[PDB]
Design a protein around this motif. Structure first.
Motif, short mmCIF file in Angstrom:
data_model
loop_
_atom_site.label_atom_id
_atom_site.label_comp_id
_atom_site.label_asym_id
_atom_site.label_seq_id
_atom_site.Cartn_x
_atom_site.Cartn_y
_atom_site.Cartn_z
N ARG A 77 0.79 -1.22 0.00
CA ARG A 77 0.00 0.00 0.00
C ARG A 77 0.83 1.28 0.00
NH1 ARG A 77 -3.69 -2.43 1.18
NH2 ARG A 77 -2.97 -3.19 3.22
N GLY A 78 2.15 1.19 0.15
CA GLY A 78 2.94 2.40 0.16
C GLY A 78 2.52 3.32 1.29
N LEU A 79 2.49 4.62 1.00
CA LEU A 79 2.14 5.64 1.98
C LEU A 79 0.78 6.23 1.63
CD1 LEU A 79 2.58 7.62 4.29
CD2 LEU A 79 4.01 8.98 2.76
N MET A 80 -0.21 5.98 2.48
CA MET A 80 -1.54 6.53 2.33
C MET A 80 -1.86 7.38 3.56
SD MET A 80 -3.95 3.62 0.61
CE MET A 80 -5.22 4.83 0.26
N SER A 81 -2.57 8.48 3.35
CA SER A 81 -2.88 9.39 4.44
C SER A 81 -4.15 10.16 4.12
CB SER A 81 -1.72 10.36 4.70
OG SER A 81 -1.54 11.23 3.60
N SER A 82 -4.81 10.64 5.17
CA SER A 82 -5.98 11.49 5.02
C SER A 82 -5.53 12.95 5.04
CB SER A 82 -6.98 11.22 6.14
OG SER A 82 -7.41 9.88 6.12
N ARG A 83 -5.86 13.68 3.98
CA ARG A 83 -5.40 15.06 3.84
C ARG A 83 -6.42 16.07 4.35
NH1 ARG A 83 -0.25 13.99 1.96
NH2 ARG A 83 -0.16 16.07 2.92
N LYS A 84 -7.70 15.85 4.08
CA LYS A 84 -8.72 16.83 4.40
C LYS A 84 -10.04 16.12 4.66
CE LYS A 84 -8.55 20.92 3.75
NZ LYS A 84 -9.08 21.31 5.09
N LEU A 85 -10.81 16.64 5.61
CA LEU A 85 -12.10 16.06 5.97
C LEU A 85 -13.07 17.20 6.25
CD1 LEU A 85 -14.17 14.02 6.81
CD2 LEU A 85 -12.98 13.73 8.98
N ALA A 125 -5.11 22.33 -5.02
CA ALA A 125 -5.72 23.36 -4.20
C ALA A 125 -7.18 23.02 -3.96
CB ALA A 125 -5.60 24.74 -4.87
N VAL A 126 -7.57 22.95 -2.70
CA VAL A 126 -8.91 22.54 -2.30
C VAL A 126 -9.55 23.69 -1.54
CG1 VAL A 126 -7.82 21.34 -0.39
CG2 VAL A 126 -10.26 21.02 -0.82
N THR A 127 -10.75 24.08 -1.96
CA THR A 127 -11.48 25.18 -1.35
C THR A 127 -12.91 24.74 -1.08
OG1 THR A 127 -12.07 26.11 -3.50
CG2 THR A 127 -10.06 26.91 -2.46
N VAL A 128 -13.52 25.33 -0.06
CA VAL A 128 -14.89 25.02 0.33
C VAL A 128 -15.71 26.30 0.23
CG1 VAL A 128 -16.32 23.82 2.00
CG2 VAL A 128 -13.85 23.40 1.94
N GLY A 129 -16.82 26.23 -0.49
CA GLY A 129 -17.68 27.38 -0.64
C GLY A 129 -18.56 27.61 0.57
N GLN A 130 -19.41 28.63 0.47
CA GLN A 130 -20.31 28.97 1.56
C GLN A 130 -21.53 28.06 1.52
OE1 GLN A 130 -20.22 30.40 4.92
NE2 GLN A 130 -18.65 31.13 3.49
N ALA A 131 -21.79 27.37 2.63
CA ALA A 131 -22.92 26.46 2.69
C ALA A 131 -24.22 27.23 2.91
CB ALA A 131 -22.72 25.45 3.82
N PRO A 132 -25.35 26.62 2.58
CA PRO A 132 -26.64 27.27 2.85
C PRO A 132 -26.79 27.62 4.33
CG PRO A 132 -26.95 25.41 1.40
CD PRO A 132 -25.53 25.35 1.86
N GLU A 133 -27.83 28.40 4.62
CA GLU A 133 -27.99 28.93 5.97
C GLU A 133 -28.28 27.83 6.99
OE1 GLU A 133 -32.03 27.96 4.95
OE2 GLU A 133 -29.91 27.82 4.42
N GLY A 134 -28.89 26.73 6.57
CA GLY A 134 -29.26 25.67 7.48
C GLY A 134 -28.20 24.62 7.71
N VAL A 135 -27.00 24.80 7.18
CA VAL A 135 -25.94 23.80 7.24
C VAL A 135 -24.67 24.45 7.78
CG1 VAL A 135 -24.56 22.14 5.96
CG2 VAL A 135 -26.94 22.52 5.33
N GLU A 136 -23.98 23.74 8.66
CA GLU A 136 -22.71 24.19 9.22
C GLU A 136 -21.58 23.39 8.61
OE1 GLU A 136 -22.51 24.04 13.46
OE2 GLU A 136 -20.32 23.92 13.50
N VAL A 137 -20.50 24.07 8.26
CA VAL A 137 -19.33 23.42 7.67
C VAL A 137 -18.24 23.32 8.72
CG1 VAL A 137 -17.63 23.52 5.83
CG2 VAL A 137 -19.95 24.32 5.41
N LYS A 138 -17.77 22.10 8.97
CA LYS A 138 -16.68 21.84 9.89
C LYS A 138 -15.55 21.15 9.15
CE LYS A 138 -17.72 20.91 14.11
NZ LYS A 138 -18.14 20.29 15.40
N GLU A 139 -14.32 21.57 9.43
CA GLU A 139 -13.14 20.99 8.80
C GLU A 139 -12.32 20.29 9.88
OE1 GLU A 139 -10.91 23.28 5.86
OE2 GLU A 139 -12.58 24.71 5.80
N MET A 140 -12.52 18.98 10.02
CA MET A 140 -11.73 18.20 10.96
C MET A 140 -10.27 18.15 10.55
SD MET A 140 -14.32 17.71 12.72
CE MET A 140 -16.00 17.15 12.90
N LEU A 141 -9.98 18.29 9.26
CA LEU A 141 -8.62 18.33 8.76
C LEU A 141 -8.47 19.43 7.71
CD1 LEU A 141 -7.00 14.82 8.21
CD2 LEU A 141 -6.19 16.69 9.64
#
Length: 141
Positions: A77-85, A125-141
């Motif tokens: 499997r070489g080197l695998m990792s989680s970059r963003k969540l 390059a990874v970007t997250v847009g603005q979520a609707p008013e009823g949803v909260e965006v959390k970035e664990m990573l």
RNA sequence: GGAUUGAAACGCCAUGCUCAGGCUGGCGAGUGCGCGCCACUCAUCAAG
């Protein structure tokens, strides 16, 4: 798109006496030079209510996702990792916006100074847009 | 809130291309070929 590379390898020892009777065997090994994978998922609170999936379980789940590959090391499997969540938390028990429109908010594109095949996470390059008013965006990573 | 021939479901564990082998032995740029034949600085102008 990924372009897996095939690697030819040899082994000193033969396994059977039959093939021993000059004594080496050649195998092959398949590797992806680099690739960034996107995994989507859904958690249904109404189903959780029918099985007791609690908030401590959810935190453990996030921990597993961010640390999923740390204990899965092996020769192949070489080197695998989680970059963003990115986690979208809905105000209402059932959702507040369509899921597919939330997934669209996560734009993954290649960095500006990078050309040719990607070989590290820094080439993206990874970007997250603005979520609707009823949803909260959390970035664990 | 009972049932999407559904609900659960790793291709996975691991494996030297190695041990080694002069691009070498040797081969005149060389024999030779006037920059040379000619051509006034010159016709004048106190010292105050």
């Amino acid at each position: 798109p990924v372009v897996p590379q095939e690697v030819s390898i040899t082994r000193m020892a033969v396994t059977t006496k039959a093939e021993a009777e000059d004594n080496r065997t050649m195998g092959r090994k398949h590797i992806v030079p680099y690739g960034l994978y996107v995994a989507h998922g859904f958690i249904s609170a109404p189903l959780a209510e029918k099985t007791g999936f609690s908030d401590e379980d959810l935190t453990l789940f996030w921990d597993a996702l961010v640390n999923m590959f740390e204990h899965d090391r092996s020769a192949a499997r070489g080197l695998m990792s989680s970059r963003k969540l990115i986690v979208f938390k809905h105000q209402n028990r059932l959702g507040n916006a369509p899921a597919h429109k939330l997934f669209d908010l996560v734009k993954v594109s290649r960095a500006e100074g990078s050309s040719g095949p990607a070989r590290s996470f820094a080439d993206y390059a990874v970007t997250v847009g603005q979520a609707p008013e009823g949803v909260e965006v959390k970035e664990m990573l």
